[PDB]
Amino acid sequence: LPDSVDWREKGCVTEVKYQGSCGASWAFSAVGALEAQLKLKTGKLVSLSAQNLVDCSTEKYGNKGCNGGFMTTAFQYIIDNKGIDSDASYPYKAMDLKCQYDSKYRAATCSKYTELPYGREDVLKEAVANKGPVSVGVDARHPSFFLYRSGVYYEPSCTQNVNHGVLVVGYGDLNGKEYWLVKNSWGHNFGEEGYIRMARNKGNHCGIASFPSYPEI
Helix, strand or coil: CCCCEEHHHHCCCCCCCECCCCECHHHHHHHHHHHHHHHHHHCCCCCECHHHHHHHCCHHHCCCCCECCCHHHHHHHHHHHCCEEECCCCCCCCCCCCCCCCHHHEEECCCEEEECCCCCHHHHHHHHHHCCCEEEEECCCCHHHHHCCCCEECCCCCCCCCCEEEEEEEEEEECCEEEEEEECCECCCCCECCEEEEECCCCCHHHCCCCCEEEEC
């Protein structure tokens, strides 16, 4: 509906996190989505525990901690577990730890998650506008990605084999170039203060709408 959305303008996006050498982007992506939803429901913006998912959403959800995982099953874990701690209560260590969940510090819950149709950029656009930030994967395995500083990112060698979880917090257009506003988990010195604008409506560029999902409370 709207031509541009930026969920940061609604106070629904916490600060950019730094995953370090641990391959937990799936966890950062999951919590980012849930953070927006928690804001929408309580009015509170609070960073959720990515480590909680790293240590606790393991084998049963096909997730392998610092060796990767799934935002959808991360959500299921939250549902099954009936909660997730705040990042403050269960801090990010960038490494596998025994599950240390503790209900005393639960900061959010999830009732259901919803996955969008493969490659459908119009459907993702609608979800982003109407539901909130959406968890997606991208193919980030190109020097071009690590090195992005500014502008609308387009990589000719990008494929639809996603390998990095990120968070679509909006969309818009930069002088005729439609993009998806992506929150990364590579710290504030990546791209535009930790964000990247990736080509939108360019044939599911880097698999951005290949595997999208968002939770609900």
